[PDB]
PDB file of C-alpha atoms in Angstrom:
ATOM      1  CA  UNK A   1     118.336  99.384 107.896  1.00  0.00           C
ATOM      2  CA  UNK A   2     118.383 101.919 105.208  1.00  0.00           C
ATOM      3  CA  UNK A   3     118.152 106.032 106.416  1.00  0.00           C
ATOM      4  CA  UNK A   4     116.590 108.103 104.141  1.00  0.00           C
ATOM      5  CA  UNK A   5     117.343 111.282 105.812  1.00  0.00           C
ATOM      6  CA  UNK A   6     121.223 110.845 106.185  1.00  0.00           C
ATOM      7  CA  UNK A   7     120.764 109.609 101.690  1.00  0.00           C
ATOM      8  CA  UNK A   8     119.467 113.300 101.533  1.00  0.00           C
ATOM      9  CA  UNK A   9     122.241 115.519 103.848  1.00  0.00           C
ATOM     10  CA  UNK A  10     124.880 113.193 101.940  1.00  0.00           C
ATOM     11  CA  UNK A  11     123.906 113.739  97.975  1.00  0.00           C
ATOM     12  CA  UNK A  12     123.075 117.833  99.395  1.00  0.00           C
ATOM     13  CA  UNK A  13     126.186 118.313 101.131  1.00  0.00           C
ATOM     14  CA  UNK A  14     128.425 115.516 100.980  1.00  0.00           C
ATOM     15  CA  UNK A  15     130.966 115.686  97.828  1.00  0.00           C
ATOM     16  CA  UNK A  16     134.862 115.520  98.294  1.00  0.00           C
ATOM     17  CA  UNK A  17     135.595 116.136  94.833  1.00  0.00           C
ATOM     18  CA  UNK A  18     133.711 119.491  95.045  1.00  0.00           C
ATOM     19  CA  UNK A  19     135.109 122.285  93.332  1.00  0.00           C
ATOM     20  CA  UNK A  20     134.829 126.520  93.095  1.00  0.00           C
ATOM     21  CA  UNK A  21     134.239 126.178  89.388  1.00  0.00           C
ATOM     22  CA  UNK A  22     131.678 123.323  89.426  1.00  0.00           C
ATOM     23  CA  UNK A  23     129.031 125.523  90.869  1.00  0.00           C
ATOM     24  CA  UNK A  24     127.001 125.628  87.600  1.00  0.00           C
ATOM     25  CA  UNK A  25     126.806 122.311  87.361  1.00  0.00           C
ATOM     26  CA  UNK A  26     125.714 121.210  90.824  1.00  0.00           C
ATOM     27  CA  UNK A  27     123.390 123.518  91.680  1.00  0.00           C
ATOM     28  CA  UNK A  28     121.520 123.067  87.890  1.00  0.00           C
ATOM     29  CA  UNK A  29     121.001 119.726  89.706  1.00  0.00           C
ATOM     30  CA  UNK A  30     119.221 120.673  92.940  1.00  0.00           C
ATOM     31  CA  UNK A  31     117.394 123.470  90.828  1.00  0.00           C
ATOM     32  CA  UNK A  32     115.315 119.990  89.814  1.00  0.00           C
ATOM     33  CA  UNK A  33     114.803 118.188  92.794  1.00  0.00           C
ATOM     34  CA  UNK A  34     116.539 129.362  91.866  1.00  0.00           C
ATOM     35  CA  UNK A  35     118.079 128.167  94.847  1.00  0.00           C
ATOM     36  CA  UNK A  36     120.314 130.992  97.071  1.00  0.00           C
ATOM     37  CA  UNK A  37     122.916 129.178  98.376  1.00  0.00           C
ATOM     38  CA  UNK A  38     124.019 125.621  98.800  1.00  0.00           C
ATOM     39  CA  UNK A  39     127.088 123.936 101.170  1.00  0.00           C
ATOM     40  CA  UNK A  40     128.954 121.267 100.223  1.00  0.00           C
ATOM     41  CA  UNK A  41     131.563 119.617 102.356  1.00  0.00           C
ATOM     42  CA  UNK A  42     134.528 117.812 100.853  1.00  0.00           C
ATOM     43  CA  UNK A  43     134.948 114.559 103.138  1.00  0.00           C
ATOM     44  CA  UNK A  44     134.270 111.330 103.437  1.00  0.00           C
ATOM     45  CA  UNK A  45     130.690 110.420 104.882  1.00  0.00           C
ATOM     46  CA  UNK A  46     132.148 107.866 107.602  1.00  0.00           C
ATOM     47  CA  UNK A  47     134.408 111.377 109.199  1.00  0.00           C
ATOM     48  CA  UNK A  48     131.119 113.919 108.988  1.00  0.00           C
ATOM     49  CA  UNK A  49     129.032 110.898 110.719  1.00  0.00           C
ATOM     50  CA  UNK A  50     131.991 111.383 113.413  1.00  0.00           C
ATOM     51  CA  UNK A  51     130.429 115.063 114.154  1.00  0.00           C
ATOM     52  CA  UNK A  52     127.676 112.668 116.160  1.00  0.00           C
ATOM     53  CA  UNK A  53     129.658 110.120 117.454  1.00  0.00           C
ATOM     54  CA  UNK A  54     132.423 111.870 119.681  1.00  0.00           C
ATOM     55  CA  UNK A  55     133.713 114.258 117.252  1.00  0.00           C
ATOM     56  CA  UNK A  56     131.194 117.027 117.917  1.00  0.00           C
ATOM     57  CA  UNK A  57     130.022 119.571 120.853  1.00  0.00           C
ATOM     58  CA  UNK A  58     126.466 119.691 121.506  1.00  0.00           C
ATOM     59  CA  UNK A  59     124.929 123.504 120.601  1.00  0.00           C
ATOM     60  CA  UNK A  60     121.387 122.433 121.425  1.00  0.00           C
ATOM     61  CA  UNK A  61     117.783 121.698 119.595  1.00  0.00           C
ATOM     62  CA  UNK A  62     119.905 118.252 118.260  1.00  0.00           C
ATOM     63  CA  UNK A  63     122.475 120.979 116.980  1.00  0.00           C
ATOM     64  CA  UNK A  64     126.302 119.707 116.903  1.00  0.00           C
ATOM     65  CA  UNK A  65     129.185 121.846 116.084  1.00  0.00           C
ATOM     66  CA  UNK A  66     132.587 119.922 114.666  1.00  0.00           C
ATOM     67  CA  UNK A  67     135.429 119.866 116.979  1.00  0.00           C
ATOM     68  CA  UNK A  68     137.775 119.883 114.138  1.00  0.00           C
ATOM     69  CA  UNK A  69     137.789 122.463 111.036  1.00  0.00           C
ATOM     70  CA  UNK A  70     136.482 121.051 107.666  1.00  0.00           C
ATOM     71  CA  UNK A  71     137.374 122.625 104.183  1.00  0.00           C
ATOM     72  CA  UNK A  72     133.738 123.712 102.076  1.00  0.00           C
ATOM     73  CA  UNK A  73     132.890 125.358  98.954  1.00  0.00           C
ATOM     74  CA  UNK A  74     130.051 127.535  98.733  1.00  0.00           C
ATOM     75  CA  UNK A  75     127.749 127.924  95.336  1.00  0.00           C
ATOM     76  CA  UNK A  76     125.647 131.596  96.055  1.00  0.00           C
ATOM     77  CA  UNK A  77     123.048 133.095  93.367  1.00  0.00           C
ATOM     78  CA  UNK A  78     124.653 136.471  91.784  1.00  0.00           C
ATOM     79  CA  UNK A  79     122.494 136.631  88.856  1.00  0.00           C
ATOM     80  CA  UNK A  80     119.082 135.542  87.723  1.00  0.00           C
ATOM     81  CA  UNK A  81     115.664 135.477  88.697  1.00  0.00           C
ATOM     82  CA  UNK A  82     114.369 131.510  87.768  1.00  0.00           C
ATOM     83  CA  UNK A  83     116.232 128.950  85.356  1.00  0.00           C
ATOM     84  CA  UNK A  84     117.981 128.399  82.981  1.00  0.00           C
ATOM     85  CA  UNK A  85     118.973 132.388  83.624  1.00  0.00           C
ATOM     86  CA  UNK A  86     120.454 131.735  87.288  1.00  0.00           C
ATOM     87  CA  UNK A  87     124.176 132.092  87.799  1.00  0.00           C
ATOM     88  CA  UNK A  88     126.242 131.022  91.017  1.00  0.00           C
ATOM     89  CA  UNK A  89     129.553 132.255  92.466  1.00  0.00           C
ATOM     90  CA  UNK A  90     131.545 129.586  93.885  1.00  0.00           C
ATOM     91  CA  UNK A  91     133.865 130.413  96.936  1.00  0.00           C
ATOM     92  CA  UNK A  92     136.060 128.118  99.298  1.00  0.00           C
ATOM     93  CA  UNK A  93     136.019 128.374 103.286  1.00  0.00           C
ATOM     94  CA  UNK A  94     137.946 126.130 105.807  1.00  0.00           C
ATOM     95  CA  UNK A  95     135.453 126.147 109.456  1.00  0.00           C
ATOM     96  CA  UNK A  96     133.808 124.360 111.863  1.00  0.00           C
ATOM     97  CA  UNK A  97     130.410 123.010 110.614  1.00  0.00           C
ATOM     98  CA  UNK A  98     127.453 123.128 112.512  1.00  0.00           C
ATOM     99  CA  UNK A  99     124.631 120.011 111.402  1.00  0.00           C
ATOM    100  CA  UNK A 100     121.586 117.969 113.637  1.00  0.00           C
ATOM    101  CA  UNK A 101     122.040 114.442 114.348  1.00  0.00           C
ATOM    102  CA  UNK A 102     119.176 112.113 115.017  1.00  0.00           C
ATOM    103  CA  UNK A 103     121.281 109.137 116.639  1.00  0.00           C
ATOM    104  CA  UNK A 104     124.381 108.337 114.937  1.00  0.00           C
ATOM    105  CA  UNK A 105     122.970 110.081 111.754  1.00  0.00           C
ATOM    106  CA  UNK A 106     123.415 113.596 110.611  1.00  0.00           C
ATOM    107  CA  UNK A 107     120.377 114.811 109.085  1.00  0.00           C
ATOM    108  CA  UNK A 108     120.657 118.336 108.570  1.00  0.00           C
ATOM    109  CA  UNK A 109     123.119 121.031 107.494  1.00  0.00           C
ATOM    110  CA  UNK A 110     122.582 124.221 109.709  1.00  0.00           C
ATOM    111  CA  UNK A 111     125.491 126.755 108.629  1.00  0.00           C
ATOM    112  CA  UNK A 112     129.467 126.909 109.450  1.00  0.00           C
ATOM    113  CA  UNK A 113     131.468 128.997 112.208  1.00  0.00           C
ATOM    114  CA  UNK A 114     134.610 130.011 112.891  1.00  0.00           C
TER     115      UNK A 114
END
């Protein structure tokens, strides 16, 4: 029953014990798998799936903006041209998040608004 493509959005841009001052850390992990920016959402998965089950307003292309505001932080590259000589700024932001679903199953992160 397993999807592979929700695994993905969720270990991206799913963490609710994210942090400004953590951005070293997390990104040195998806600088494996120099990256410029990276998302992450602090929620549970169960109310992010809820952007594609009644909680969201269709934008299009499978696009689905929240209906309520979530709280993010944001690692960006200030420094650096390839590791281990990057360096990220972390900053904190509390909008609307745009993401595709494919069913029940968000699959894609696609920016914030508002």
């Amino acid at each position: 029953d397993v999807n592979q493509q929700y695994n993905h959005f969720l270990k991206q841009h799913v963490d609710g014990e994210m942090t400004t001052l953590k951005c070293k850390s997390q990104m040195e992990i998806l600088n494996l798998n120099c990256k410029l920016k990276n998302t992450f959402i602090l929620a549970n998965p169960d109310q992010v799936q809820a952007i594609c089950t009644g909680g969201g307003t269709l934008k299009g292309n499978n696009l689905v903006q929240s209906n309520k505001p979530f709280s993010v932080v944001i690692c960006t590259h200030t420094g650096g041209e390839s590791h281990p000589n990057c360096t990220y700024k972390g900053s904190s932001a509390t909008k609307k998040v745009i993401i595709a679903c494919d069913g029940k199953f968000p699959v894609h992160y696609d920016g914030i608004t508002d």
